[PDB]
Design a protein around this motif. Structure first.
Motif, short mmCIF file in Angstrom:
data_model
loop_
_atom_site.label_atom_id
_atom_site.label_comp_id
_atom_site.label_asym_id
_atom_site.label_seq_id
_atom_site.Cartn_x
_atom_site.Cartn_y
_atom_site.Cartn_z
N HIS A 1 -4.19 4.94 16.80
CA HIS A 1 -5.62 5.69 16.70
C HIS A 1 -6.77 5.01 16.44
CE1 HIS A 1 -7.06 10.07 14.88
NE2 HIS A 1 -7.19 9.75 16.15
N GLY A 2 -7.01 4.21 15.18
CA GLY A 2 -8.13 3.47 15.25
C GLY A 2 -7.80 1.98 14.69
N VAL A 3 -8.12 2.07 13.37
CA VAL A 3 -7.87 0.44 12.60
C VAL A 3 -7.08 -0.87 13.52
CG1 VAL A 3 -8.05 1.14 10.24
CG2 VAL A 3 -6.13 1.62 11.47
N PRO B 1 -4.38 1.86 8.19
CA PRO B 1 -5.62 1.51 7.78
C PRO B 1 -5.80 0.63 6.68
CG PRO B 1 -5.41 4.17 8.17
CD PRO B 1 -3.90 3.35 8.12
N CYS B 2 -4.99 1.02 5.64
CA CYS B 2 -4.85 -0.13 4.45
C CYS B 2 -3.91 -1.13 4.63
CB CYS B 2 -4.51 0.93 3.21
SG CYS B 2 -4.00 -0.08 1.79
N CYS C 1 0.80 -1.25 -0.12
CA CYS C 1 -0.12 0.06 -0.12
C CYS C 1 0.72 1.17 -0.20
CB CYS C 1 -0.94 0.09 1.09
SG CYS C 1 -2.41 1.09 0.98
N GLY C 2 1.78 1.36 -0.95
CA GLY C 2 2.75 2.63 -1.14
C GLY C 2 3.85 2.44 -0.17
N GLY C 3 3.66 2.40 1.05
CA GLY C 3 4.57 2.17 2.17
C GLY C 3 4.29 3.17 3.30
N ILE C 4 4.04 2.51 4.56
CA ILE C 4 3.91 3.38 5.85
C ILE C 4 2.43 3.74 5.94
CG2 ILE C 4 4.57 4.95 7.42
CD1 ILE C 4 6.56 2.65 7.06
N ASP C 5 1.54 2.62 6.08
CA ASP C 5 0.12 2.86 6.46
C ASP C 5 -0.21 1.86 7.42
OD1 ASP C 5 -2.19 4.33 6.15
OD2 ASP C 5 -2.77 2.91 4.22
N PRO D 1 -6.76 7.17 10.05
CA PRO D 1 -7.20 5.82 10.32
C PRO D 1 -8.37 5.77 11.25
CG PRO D 1 -5.02 6.00 11.36
CD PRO D 1 -5.33 7.11 10.19
N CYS D 2 -8.80 6.66 12.07
CA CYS D 2 -9.92 6.82 13.04
C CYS D 2 -11.12 7.93 12.62
CB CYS D 2 -9.77 6.70 14.29
SG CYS D 2 -10.80 7.22 15.64
N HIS E 1 -3.49 7.78 1.10
CA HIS E 1 -2.92 6.77 1.38
C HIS E 1 -3.65 5.74 2.39
CE1 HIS E 1 1.38 5.14 3.03
NE2 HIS E 1 0.69 4.20 2.25
#
Lengths: 61, 61
Positions: free
Chosen positions: A52-54, A30-31, A24-28, B30-31, B52
């Protein structure tokens, strides 16, 4: 016995996470989370400062 | 008109994007996506250079 994404071997992040990051591109998060929920080499190595979330939703930090 | 979350009412991002910040404690994505879908008020204010994480998932850019 029980260690699905536990401690100590959480430093294996530079392998599974490293490869998942390139998906996913790099440094993520959520994805990249889609491929983060695999094996036991994650934990507080990736979603540490990224709580944070995900990923935090699954509690990995 | 037929323009929900379109490039014009982008200035209204100070309500949903800046509001989602306090909603999830901090700013990221993300959130922040959760409170991002507040009818509209998104547009090219979010997901621009930040396409992203979940920002591309909930296609905006």
């Amino acid at each position: 016995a029980m260690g699905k994404c536990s401690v100590l071997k959480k430093v294996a992040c530079a392998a599974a996470i490293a490869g998942a990051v390139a998906a996913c591109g790099g440094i993520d998060l959520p994805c990249v989370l889609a491929a983060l929920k695999a094996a036991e080499g994650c934990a507080s190595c990736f979603c540490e400062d990224h709580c944070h979330g995900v990923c935090k939703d699954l509690h990995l930090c």
